[PDB]
Short mmCIF file of C-alpha atoms in Angstrom, two decimals:
data_model
loop_
_atom_site.label_atom_id
_atom_site.label_comp_id
_atom_site.label_asym_id
_atom_site.label_seq_id
_atom_site.Cartn_x
_atom_site.Cartn_y
_atom_site.Cartn_z
CA UNK A 26 -68.39 48.85 95.67
CA UNK A 27 -68.71 51.64 94.10
CA UNK A 28 -66.83 54.41 92.94
CA UNK A 29 -67.38 58.18 91.42
CA UNK A 30 -64.75 59.63 89.27
CA UNK A 31 -64.87 63.43 88.30
CA UNK A 32 -63.54 64.82 85.15
CA UNK A 33 -63.82 68.68 84.26
CA UNK A 34 -66.43 69.60 84.80
CA UNK A 35 -67.20 67.44 88.18
CA UNK A 36 -69.00 64.45 85.97
CA UNK A 37 -70.48 61.58 87.64
CA UNK A 38 -69.34 57.94 86.95
CA UNK A 39 -70.19 54.71 88.99
CA UNK A 40 -68.15 51.96 88.45
CA UNK A 41 -69.14 47.81 89.33
CA UNK A 42 -65.57 46.70 91.10
CA UNK A 43 -64.71 43.91 93.14
CA UNK A 44 -61.85 44.15 96.33
CA UNK A 45 -59.53 42.16 94.37
CA UNK A 46 -59.72 44.66 91.40
CA UNK A 47 -56.56 46.11 90.04
CA UNK A 48 -56.36 50.10 89.85
CA UNK A 49 -54.81 49.21 85.67
CA UNK A 50 -58.15 47.18 85.32
CA UNK A 51 -60.39 50.38 87.22
CA UNK A 52 -58.64 52.18 84.28
CA UNK A 53 -59.48 49.65 82.17
CA UNK A 54 -62.89 50.02 82.79
CA UNK A 55 -62.79 54.29 82.94
CA UNK A 56 -61.55 53.76 79.24
CA UNK A 57 -64.34 52.26 77.55
CA UNK A 58 -66.31 54.17 78.80
CA UNK A 59 -64.97 57.73 78.12
CA UNK A 60 -61.71 56.88 75.70
CA UNK A 61 -59.15 58.43 78.33
CA UNK A 62 -55.92 56.43 77.20
CA UNK A 63 -55.08 54.94 81.22
CA UNK A 64 -51.45 56.34 80.58
CA UNK A 65 -53.09 59.97 80.89
CA UNK A 66 -55.49 58.90 83.54
CA UNK A 67 -53.90 59.45 87.80
CA UNK A 68 -56.14 58.48 90.15
CA UNK A 69 -56.19 60.12 93.96
CA UNK A 70 -58.07 59.69 97.01
CA UNK A 71 -57.25 60.37 100.73
CA UNK A 72 -54.64 63.03 99.69
CA UNK A 73 -53.09 60.43 98.13
CA UNK A 74 -51.22 59.66 94.78
CA UNK A 75 -53.03 56.37 94.59
CA UNK A 76 -50.25 53.11 93.52
CA UNK A 77 -50.38 50.31 91.21
CA UNK A 78 -48.91 47.67 93.68
CA UNK A 79 -51.79 48.64 96.43
CA UNK A 80 -54.97 48.02 96.49
CA UNK A 81 -58.82 49.68 98.25
CA UNK A 82 -58.43 48.41 102.01
CA UNK A 83 -54.55 50.01 102.31
CA UNK A 84 -56.34 53.56 101.55
CA UNK A 85 -59.66 52.94 103.78
CA UNK A 86 -61.89 53.71 101.09
CA UNK A 87 -65.48 52.25 102.25
CA UNK A 88 -68.53 51.64 100.20
CA UNK A 89 -69.51 55.03 97.58
CA UNK A 90 -66.62 56.68 98.06
CA UNK A 91 -66.02 59.74 95.26
CA UNK A 92 -61.68 59.71 93.66
CA UNK A 93 -61.17 63.00 92.23
CA UNK A 94 -59.97 63.21 88.50
CA UNK A 95 -58.85 66.12 85.96
CA UNK A 96 -59.06 66.36 82.17
CA UNK A 97 -55.98 67.12 80.38
CA UNK A 98 -55.68 71.22 78.58
CA UNK A 99 -52.49 71.26 79.87
CA UNK A 100 -51.34 68.48 81.79
CA UNK A 101 -53.67 67.09 83.70
CA UNK B 188 -63.24 90.66 100.72
CA UNK B 189 -62.13 90.70 96.93
CA UNK B 190 -60.75 87.81 96.99
CA UNK B 191 -61.83 84.38 97.60
CA UNK B 192 -59.77 81.26 99.74
CA UNK B 193 -60.36 78.15 98.57
CA UNK B 194 -59.94 74.54 101.08
CA UNK B 195 -58.18 72.07 98.70
CA UNK B 196 -59.56 69.12 100.32
CA UNK B 197 -58.15 66.60 97.08
CA UNK B 198 -54.09 67.15 97.74
CA UNK B 199 -52.20 66.45 94.46
CA UNK B 200 -48.61 66.11 94.41
CA UNK B 201 -46.02 67.73 91.76
CA UNK B 202 -46.99 66.56 88.86
CA UNK B 203 -45.44 69.20 86.38
CA UNK B 204 -42.96 72.09 86.25
CA UNK B 205 -45.48 74.59 84.90
CA UNK B 206 -48.15 73.74 87.86
CA UNK B 207 -48.65 74.75 91.03
CA UNK B 208 -47.76 71.89 93.57
CA UNK B 209 -50.72 72.56 96.46
CA UNK B 210 -50.68 69.77 99.22
CA UNK B 211 -53.09 70.07 101.89
CA UNK B 212 -53.77 72.05 104.37
CA UNK B 213 -52.52 74.94 102.87
CA UNK B 214 -54.27 78.69 101.74
CA UNK B 215 -53.73 79.71 97.86
CA UNK B 216 -54.65 82.92 97.08
CA UNK B 217 -56.97 83.76 94.36
CA UNK B 218 -54.84 85.66 92.03
CA UNK B 219 -57.02 85.30 88.44
CA UNK B 220 -60.13 83.42 87.72
CA UNK B 221 -60.28 80.88 84.93
CA UNK B 222 -62.22 81.49 81.29
CA UNK B 223 -65.47 78.82 81.11
CA UNK B 224 -64.64 75.64 81.74
CA UNK B 225 -64.70 75.25 85.15
CA UNK B 226 -61.35 73.01 86.99
CA UNK B 227 -58.79 75.42 86.09
CA UNK B 228 -57.35 78.38 87.70
CA UNK B 229 -53.91 79.95 89.04
CA UNK B 230 -52.26 80.48 92.60
CA UNK B 231 -49.41 81.04 94.37
CA UNK B 232 -48.28 78.81 96.44
CA UNK B 233 -44.40 78.58 98.40
CA UNK B 234 -43.26 81.16 95.79
CA UNK B 235 -44.94 79.95 92.55
CA UNK B 236 -47.16 80.38 90.07
CA UNK B 237 -49.37 76.91 88.46
CA UNK B 238 -52.64 76.40 87.17
CA UNK B 239 -54.65 73.50 89.15
CA UNK B 240 -58.39 71.93 89.13
CA UNK B 241 -60.02 73.44 91.57
CA UNK B 242 -62.74 70.67 91.91
CA UNK B 243 -59.82 69.00 94.04
CA UNK B 244 -61.53 71.15 96.63
CA UNK B 245 -64.39 73.16 97.74
CA UNK B 246 -65.89 76.59 98.49
CA UNK B 247 -65.54 77.44 102.30
CA UNK B 248 -69.20 78.65 102.77
CA UNK B 249 -67.70 82.15 104.82
#
């Protein structure tokens, strides 16, 4: 399934992933595409801050789901 | 009305001390608008003042 990440202005990012992919891995894919270091990125979905030891299914994320992200002008 | 009320669909969590902590299901009164970059703002919640990304929120049409 494809997921979307929005930046400061709400930019749209399409990624190819597998349900078995880890969140750290997803961050790595974002780094490759946008140059944002993984330590400066916080992932949030379904109102709860996504944890690195949990899976997408645990957060009931379905196909074409979109997450929300911040840039980093002050404190992300 | 004069000010705009916005409901936040994507709640965050206490990121910093200078940042305002907002949870889903709360209304924050917009104190003052941000510069050019659309994605930042400031509001008061729980007796605090801090900035937060407005992307995580949508505008209610009425």
